[PDB]
Design a protein around this ligand. Sequence first.
Ligand code: HEM
Length: 395
Amino acid sequence: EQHDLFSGTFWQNPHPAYAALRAEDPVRKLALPDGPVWLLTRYADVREAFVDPRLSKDWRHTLPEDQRADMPATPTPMMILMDPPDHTRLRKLVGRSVTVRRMNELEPRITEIADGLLAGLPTDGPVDLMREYAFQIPVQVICELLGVPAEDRDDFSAWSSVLVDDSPADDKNAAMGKLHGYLSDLLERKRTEPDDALLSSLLAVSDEDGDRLSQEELVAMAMLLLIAGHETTVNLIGNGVLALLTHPDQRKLLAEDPSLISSAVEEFLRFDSPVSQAPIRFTAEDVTYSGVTIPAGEMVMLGLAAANRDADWMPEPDRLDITRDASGGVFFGHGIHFCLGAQLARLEGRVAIGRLFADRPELALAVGLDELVYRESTLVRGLSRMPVTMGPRSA
Ligand code: HEM
């Protein structure tokens, strides 16, 4: 029987729609508002697709060859929108800065941010755990990462939380512009007053040939990190928290053994992937997956949330099991575009989710599951609000 796709019942719980697709319709054209897209839902296909060089990040493949004689490769100089060789250079340059130790140095501050939020939350409801906890953490973390001055945090938080869908892309189009101007100004200041944070680190990146990020490249990279790192992490927190609130057995296991948190975070990423579909790829030529040919010039979405529950990859994929091993999940992508922030996202997930459940052992949903309202956003598995009762702080 025909499950709604990206409409009606899908938004509250897409997983049965995904399971029916994997089984009976694994390469499926679906009509979306701005354009039709092809959806690949099987694990092996999604994984193959991520390394398929015929699947490009360049939108100009939607144009006939003689009509590309006008258009730029990219709307903004953003690495995620590029193929090699241009991607390879930008990835190389940002990877000089985004280091293992840099990500870890942030851990005490992530803990601080999370503890401060938890302390200001009331015991008796209702509280929206999204607006009040989940929404707040990742941008304050990005602020720490980048070296946004403390005076500017609240302002920067205001402007970026606009990007996380509230009103139409008119004042968001202007929020982008203000963020762009602000960061461009900041990069200026960092050049003469260097510090230990990411923006000044990126400015000085100078490879073996003298190559470096241009002023425009720097600003687009900064904006990318913000956009890639905010909403995604927010929904990791929300979805991971929900997973524990809806599985008392798994929450018990975490409570008894807090060190399971790292394993739990991988399992929440698998079980209810916050980036539900990868950003759109474009067919540079015809491709065939599961006997279905997608013609050249089409838009293709890799179903990460579907692939992560594919029984041909993970046995008992509909069971939540925090002791399980993550190995092979596609929630952070695969191949050349693999999430640049995956270590930080994982760190923020474990801190945010682990400290929450430590501080509030009696945390509970304040509505039924059938009353939860999900964002209607193609690429996102994200709660718009999560009503909860926090309960007493642990002694
Ligand atoms: C739970 C949170 C996160 C999830 C689920 C996630 C997921 C992903 C996925 C699936 C991709 C691949 C896109 C593609 O192949 O088309 C990606 C790329 C990226 N992510 Fe994340 N991400 C998260 C957090 C972050 C954070 C915190 C940052 C930065 C601090 C970040 C920065 C990026 C960047 C820069 C790319 C582009 C990589 C490239 O094009 O070479 N992400 N992410």
